[PDB]
Structure formats: C-alpha cells, structure tokens
Amino acid sequence: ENAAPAQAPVSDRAWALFRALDGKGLVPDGYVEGWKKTFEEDFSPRRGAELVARAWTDPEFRQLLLTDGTAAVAQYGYLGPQGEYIVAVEDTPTLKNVIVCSLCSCTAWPILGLPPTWYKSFEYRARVVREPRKVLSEMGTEIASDIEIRVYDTTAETRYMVLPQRPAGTEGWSQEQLQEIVTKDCLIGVAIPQVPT
Amino acid sequence: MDGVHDLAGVQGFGKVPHTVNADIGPTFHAEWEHLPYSLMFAGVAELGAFSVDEVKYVVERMEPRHYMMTPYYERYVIGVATLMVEKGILTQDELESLAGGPFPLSRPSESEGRPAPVETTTFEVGQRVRVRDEYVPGHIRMPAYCRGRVGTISHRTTEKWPFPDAIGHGRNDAGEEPTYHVKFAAEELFGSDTDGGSVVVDLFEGYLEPAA
Numbered sequence: 240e241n242a243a244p245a246q247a248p249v250s251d252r253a254w255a256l257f258r259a260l261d262g263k264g265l266v267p268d269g270y271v272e273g274w275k276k277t278f279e280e281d282f283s284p285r286r287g288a289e290l291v292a293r294a295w296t297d298p299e300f301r302q303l304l305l306t307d308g309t310a311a312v313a314q315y316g317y318l319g320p321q322g323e324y325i326v327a328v329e330d331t332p333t334l335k336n337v338i339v340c341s342l343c344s345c346t347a348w349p350i351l352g353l354p355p356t357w358y359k360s361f362e363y364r365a366r367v368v369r370e371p372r373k374v375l376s377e378m379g380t381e382i383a384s385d386i387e388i389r390v391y392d393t394t395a396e397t398r399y400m401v402l403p404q405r406p407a408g409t410e411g412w413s414q415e416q417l418q419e420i421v422t423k424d425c426l427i428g429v430a431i432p433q434v435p436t
Numbered sequence: 437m438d439g440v441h442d443l444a445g446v447q448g449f450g451k452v453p454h455t456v457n458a459d460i461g462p463t464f465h466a467e468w469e470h471l472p473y474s475l476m477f478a479g480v481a482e483l484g485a486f487s488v489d490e491v492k493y494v495v496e497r498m499e500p501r502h503y504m505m506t507p508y509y510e511r512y513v514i515g516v517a518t519l520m521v522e523k524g525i526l527t528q529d530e531l532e533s534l535a536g537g538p539f540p541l542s543r544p545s546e547s548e549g550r551p552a553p554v555e556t557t558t559f560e561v562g563q564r565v566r567v568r569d570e571y572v573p574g575h576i577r578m579p580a581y582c583r584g585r586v587g588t589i590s591h592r593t594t595e596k597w598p599f600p601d602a603i604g605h606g607r608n609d610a611g612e613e614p615t616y617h618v619k620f621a622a623e624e625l626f627g628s629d630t631d632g633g634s635v636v637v638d639l640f641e642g643y644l645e646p647a648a
C-alpha cells in the first residue's frame with residue numbers, strides 16, 4: 240500500500256530519453272550541450288546583481304527598472320528563456336518582497352540563475368506563501384515587525400526580481416563592490432544584502 | 437487540477453533545507469540533470485510537439501504518490517518522456533528498453549481542457565477583483581488558495597499569452613490574454629493563520645471577475 244513504483248535508475252531513464260530522441264534525428268548536434276553551457280555559464284545571479292547595483296547608483300535606471308523591467312533588462316542584453324517579461328519589486332523601509340513558484344519552480348532564469356534545490360522544495364512552496372516571516376527567520380533573515388512581507392507567487396509569465404534596500408555602510412562603493420553583496424538569495428528575496436566590517 | 441502539486445498553504449512540512457547564502461553547489465548535481473530542460477526545449481522549439489504549458493500539466497499529472505517522492509529534475513524527465521509518448525514521437529517500449537527497466541509515466545489526462553473564456557473584463561490598476569469560483573479538472577494557473585478570494589490589481593501586463601487551460605492541453609483555442617498582479621491581504625487567504633502581509637498572484641484575465 241502506498242509504495243513507490245518500480246523504476247530504473249534515474250540516470251538511465253534520463254539518458255534513455257536523450258538516446259531515444261537523438262537516435263531519431265530529433266536533437267540537433269550539440270543541442271543539449273549548448274543548453275548545459277547556457278544554464279551553467281550565462282544564466283546567473285551576477286546579472287541580477289549588476290542590475291541592482293546600477294539601480295542603486297543611477298536614479299534614472301532605478302526608475303526604469305521599477306516601471307519597465309523588461310526594457311531595463313534588455314539594455315543589458317539579459318532577456319532570455321523564462322525571463323522575457325520582467326518585473327522588479329522594490330523593498331522599502333516598510334516592505335520586504337519575496338518570490339516563489341508555489342505550483343512548480345518558475346524563476347527569472349537569465350538574471351537569477353536556475354533555481355536552487357531549496358526554492359523548488361515542497362517546504363518552501365507550501366510554507367512561504369502562508370508563513371513567510373517564520374520561513375525567512377528559520378533561513379537566517381529576521382524581518383523587523385514594522386515591515387509588511389509581500390510574497391509574489393510566479394503563477395504566469397511575469398518573472399520577478401527583488402530590488403533590495405541598499406545597506407548603510409556602502410555609500411560611495413563602486414558598482415563592482417555593490418554587486419558583490421547582492422547574492423542570489425537577495426534577488427529571490429529571502430536574504431538582505433550584508434556589509435562586512 | 438486540484439492536484440497534490442498545489443502546495444501553497446499546505447501545513448505539516450518542516451524547515452526549508454537552506455540557510456541564507458549557503459553554498460548551493462553546482463547548477464547541476466548529476467551529469468543527466470540538464471537533460472529535462474534541454475529536451476523540453478527541443479520539444480517546444482525544435483519539434484514543435486508541445487508547449488511549456490503542456491510540460492507543466494504533464495508534471496501535474498504524475499500519480500500523486502509518485503509526484504511526492506520524486507526529486508524535481510526527475511519529475512521533468514518523466515513529464516517530457518510522457519509527452520513524447522502521448523504525441524506519438526516515442527514509445528514507452530523503447531524508453532524502457534533503452535533504460536534497462538521500468539519507466540512509469542504520468543497518468544493520462546482526465547480533462548480535454550477548456551477554451552479561453554469569451555467573456556472577460558479589462559481591469560485597471562487599483563480595481564477590486566474576485567477570483568472566479570470555478571473548478572477546472574485540467575490545467576489551470578490558479579493556486580486554490582486564491583479561488584473565490586478578493587484582491588486588488590497592482591499591474592496589468594503589457595503583453596498577452598495563450599490561456600493555460602487551453603494550450604496546456606495542446607488545444608487550438610487558447611487565444612491570448614493579459615495577466616494581472618492581484619494583491620491579496622494575507623488574512624483574505626488564510627484568516628488568522630498566517631504571519632504574512634500580502635500575497636500577489638499573477639492571474640490570467642479569464643480567472644477574474646469584478647468584485648461584487
């Protein structure tokens with residue numbers, strides 16, 4: 240009762256699917272290897288970090304990113320698969336934004352990178368929409384009680400990034416310096432950018 | 437489809453397996469893990485055999501216990517394989533022969549889907565809307581937590597897309613619709629049992645109606 244179905248090892252299944260298709264001429268030469276490269280090397284949260292750093296240092300670009308995120312992202316050439324219609328959501332002294340895909344895993348791939356395992360977990364998908372404060376706390380982020388948490392559930396084609404608040408102690412930093420502290424988790428919304436001592 | 441995939445609001449799960457900024461390791465943790473998404477794209481962009489929506493739905497169609505015990509990337513292996521069988525591109529025979537053992541697939545659909553609604557409303561920022569109190573057995577991009585609930589429009593998209601409930605079943609009548617960022621108060625969705633502020637759901641026009 241309730242037992243798992245018999246299955247061949249997953250690697251064997253996955254490569255069987257590749258071989259079945261490839262042996263019918265349905266997969267172009269170098270196709271899956273090219274996607275692998277895109278997913279590993281091009282899609283990256285360093286891109287969203289660059290965008291944040293620009294917004295933090297350039298009021299005009301900030302405004303553009305918050306009004307027409309797709310146009311802002313396009314200026315950098317960072318539109319792409321699962322990242323065609325972009326909305327950036329602004330944290331404020333009274334608002335913390337957090338992103339999820341409760342139904343699956345939807346994520347702004349080109350600018351955040353492919354989602355991490357935890358983001359796709361049943362735990363995150365079930366819990367952050369209902370108890371985001373406790374989830375973030377458990378993850379290591381305490382959201383003061385004077386801040387509204389707003390969870391964006393990525394249920395259609397909008398692809399989100401969080402524009403976190405800029406921390407004190409970064410005044411005058413270069414765009415490169417700022418980018419270093421905007422992590423993947425800052426872009427998803429579960430972390431606040433940290434300044435060393 | 438009111439499947440087990442509709443997780444938001446389910447209670448009883450433990451801690452999210454992450455602490456902020458912890459090392460998540462490489463993009464792919466095994467040498468096959470890039471295959472599901474790559475082969476999805478082959479199917480969508482190269483073969484024209486199915487839409488991304490159909491991929492989402494075929495994963496929803498995994499037998500529920502199978503869904504619950506299957507790692508993420510494996511669900512998409514299963515799902516893409518299933519669509520290739522259903523579309524007559526591959527056989528389950530050949531998949532199992534090449535795998536050297538069992539390769540159970542998602543279950544058949546129990547709905548033919550539904551068309552894009554003919555009667556909908558163009559909503560404006562600040563409007564109050566209700567999520568239509570409807571039950572869709574096939575694919576739908578409406579998590580049940582918001583069904584019948586009232587919120588306010590924060591955004592109308594400037595682009596339009598095929599209605600999921602139709603293209604997710606490969607139908608010819610998906611049309612196009614914008615979607616709306618609908619902001620719900622946490623208490624509207626979960627009463628007193630929430631620690632949140634608000635939840636914004638990105639809802640197709642055809643899921644919405646004017647609030648009373």
Ligand SMILES: [Fe+3]
Nearest residue numbers: 340343344345
């Ligand atoms: Fe998703």
Ligand SMILES: [Mg+2]
Nearest residue numbers: 405409410411
């Ligand atoms: Mg300043």
Ligand SMILES: [Mg+2]
Nearest residue numbers: 438439442580
């Ligand atoms: Mg349900």
